[PDB]
Paper text:
The active ingredient of Bti is a parasporal body that contains three natural sub-micron-sized crystals of four highly efficient mosquito-specific toxins, namely [name], Cry11Aa and co-crystallizing Cry4Aa and Cry4Ba. Following ingestion by mosquito larvae, the crystals promptly dissolve in the alkaline environment of the gut (pH ~11), releasing protoxins that are activated into toxins through proteolytic cleavage of propeptides by gut enzymes. Each activated protein eventually self-assembles into cytolytic oligomers that perforate gut cells, leading to mosquito larvae death. Here, we use serial femtosecond crystallography (SFX) at an X-ray free electron laser (XFEL) to identify the features governing the in vivo crystallization of [name] in Bti cells, and to track the structural dynamics driving natural crystal dissolution in the alkaline mosquito larvae gut.
Residue numbers in the entry:
A (entry chain BBB), B (entry chain BBB): 6 to 249
Write the structure that this text describes.
């Protein structure tokens, strides 16, 4: 019942997203998949294609060294080998195998360091389109670990009084305006040593301080798009199960 | 190359889950959906059914009072009305509309209070099967809000020097051993007042202290299962878009 004011437009205020977010936890899959699958898609007709890329790079996981512990991590080298075998055929655009370290800094700093590596792998345009999920995904690598601790993508290694070893395996599938005719796939294998006992790590936040020695292995894989709109849903159920 | 030791079995050590987790962020859906869709499924053939339940309860969102701010929240009453219209037909098993409050306690405490309400709605058996996602989902209602702040399920209301108002809309779809022949659907509308400015709230952790006044509105809806294995994927793309 008030008067209608003229428009004051703040060109910096970010508008609320219209993006729909759906998370699926698939109990007891026929075939085990140890990659957290994070998908940024504008056309659901490429969901099947995204899952099938995750199915493939499952074979690029490898055990860590015995001195690290009993863990699986995505290997950049084996990833390259596997990349070649994927059909429809496609190209490895970039790859990285790099150590990241820090001393007595906040976890937030470490997150930014890791983000800097994955942003280099994705590139500016690609980073921008997935910035929210990318940030959240790296955040959830170092914090929010309690609800994740027994999940299929995280593996705990050696556990001393001064240090905890663990691996974390996440995969990004991107298909939007910035990808055009290809879907991009970016698996990431984290091998993390952190200067805290597990009980503390399980409840680490961005405010907590810690020293890290971290190895990141990743690659970027473009696969030309293949719509699946005409295939039955049974084919998607099969891809999720890893039996397709 | 070591000797093979006899088995020492600790019956309390939780085994690593085999559950596959896939998150979809669907850019620019045809129809906007303001519910975070969290799905606990053992058979992907019921994914379509889960999305279609989320599509329906979108219509049960309502604006908050003007004094709260410009926000949408799932309404338990309107939910009941909408429940009746859903096909295939089904039953409202339980519903809640309850205030939860706390004074100068840790955020962790508040999370537990809310969890106690949603566990009452789900029941013991049902709670147990989805305990990890349920805990994470309530955790992400009060913390990890920075990467979420501009997403479609969270709305910011009035923002004073002493208080922040916001709503949070999440939906659980459950289909597993504990559900049998029905899928369960549990939408949740949070109306949250918290005794901190937004800048602080955006970076609240479980360790932070705050006073809350929170209204929770939810219901539990059983729908007999309908497999979609024979339908084309285009039908799933359509359900995601809200055009089916
Ligand atoms: Na961000
Ligand atoms: Na838990």
């Amino acid at each position: 019942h008030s008067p209608l004011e003229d428009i004051k437009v703040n060109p910096w205020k970010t508008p609320q997203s219209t993006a729909r977010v759906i998370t699926l936890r698939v109990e007891d899959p026929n075939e085990i998949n140890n990659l957290l699958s994070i998908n940024e898609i504008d056309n659901p007709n490429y969901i099947l294609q995204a899952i099938m890329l995750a199915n493939a790079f499952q074979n690029a996981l490898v055990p860590t060294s015995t001195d690290f512990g009993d863990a699986l991590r995505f290997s950049m080298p084996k990833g390259l080998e596997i990349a070649n075998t994927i059909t429809p055929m496609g190209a490895v655009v970039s790859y990285v195998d790099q150590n990241v370290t820090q001393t007595n800094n906040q976890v937030s700093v470490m997150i930014n360091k890791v983000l800097e590596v994955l942003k280099t792998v994705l590139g500016v345009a690609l980073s921008g389109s997935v910035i929210d999920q990318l940030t959240a995904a790296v955040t959830n690598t170092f914090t929010n670990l309690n609800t994740q601790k027994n999940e299929a993508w995280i593996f705990w290694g050696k556990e001393t009084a001064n240090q905890t070893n663990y691996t974390y395996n996440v995969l990004f599938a991107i298909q939007n305006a910035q990808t055009g005719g290809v879907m991009y796939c970016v698996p990431v294998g984290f091998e993390i040593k952190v200067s805290a006992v597990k009980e503390q790590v399980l409840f680490f936040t961005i405010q907590d301080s810690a020293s890290y020695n971290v190895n990141i292995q990743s690659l970027k894989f473009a696969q030309p798009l293949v719509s699946s709109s005409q295939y039955p849903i049974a084919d998607l159920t099969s891809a999720i199960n890893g039996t397709l």
